[PDB]
């Protein structure tokens, strides 16, 4: 049962189909806190921003999320917590347009408040939440299927490399549909390591990564589209974490820019939120996202994630 921070993901023990009881009573008691959390930031974002029309529509989705939670009497049986994941699956779709409606109402409405780093801790405060709550909801839904290598949504012997090169493919193509090709993309280290891990916020972040990487190194030779440098991965693998160096020759982030890439919206295209989002996760995980800028040259991602609750290798 590993957790990160005040929220767990049970490792269930099937059976009479207990845990999926204990499971959803947990679930069930703990969304609502956390939605009702998520009002509050609503209820003291700037006037001006709060009264923007979108955000006033996702303001209303979770006001509804709340009460469709809470008049969801207490789960006592199976038939119960049944038609609970009907909710749960329910809230996740209607849910799932939330982080565009946010970035959209929220692009114009922020160049109006006083405070400036005040749409930011909003922003990484409700994203991560989400990200929490999407996870420890997949979760349980997950309990019920029986995949292989999986606990729920967590993957008992993950491959870093696997997971690295399904993103790759996937940004691949969207880089060579857009340029006509892509960068080739090599990965070293330990490409062998096998262990306990949660893919969900990987899946987020590296095509993240990838995207910025690969959209770089083209904007960066367009005289020799047909011929690029290479993307090099680098898997670092120890007992605190797993540690995914992504190196490009895409020329690097301007010094005029530095400062500002991290920030949500700030973007020289795709509407600026790839960076700042991925550092939120990251952090919220109990990691890191860090930059190192070769201006001439390219640019090195160190993503660094912790290990489940143990020293996995
Ligand atoms: N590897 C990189 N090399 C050079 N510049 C980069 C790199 N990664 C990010 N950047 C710059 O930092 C800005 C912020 O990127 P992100 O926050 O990922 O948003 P974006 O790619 O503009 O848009 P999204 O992610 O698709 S919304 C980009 O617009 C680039 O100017
Ligand atoms: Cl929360
Ligand atoms: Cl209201
Ligand atoms: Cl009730
Ligand atoms: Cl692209
Ligand atoms: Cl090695
Ligand atoms: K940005
Ligand atoms: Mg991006």
Redesign the pocket.
Known sequence: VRLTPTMMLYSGRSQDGSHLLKSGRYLQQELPVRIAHRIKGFRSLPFIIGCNPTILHVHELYIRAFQKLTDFPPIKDQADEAQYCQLVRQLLDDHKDVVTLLAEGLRESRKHIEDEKLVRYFLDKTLTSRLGIRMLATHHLALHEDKPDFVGIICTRLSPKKIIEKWVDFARR??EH?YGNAPRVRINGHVAARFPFIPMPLDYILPELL?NA??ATMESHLDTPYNVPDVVITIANNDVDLIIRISDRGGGIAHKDLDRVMDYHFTTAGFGFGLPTSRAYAEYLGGSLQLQSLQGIGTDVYLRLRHIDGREE
Do not use: F, Q, T, V
């Open positions: 969207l880089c857009k995207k690969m959209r």
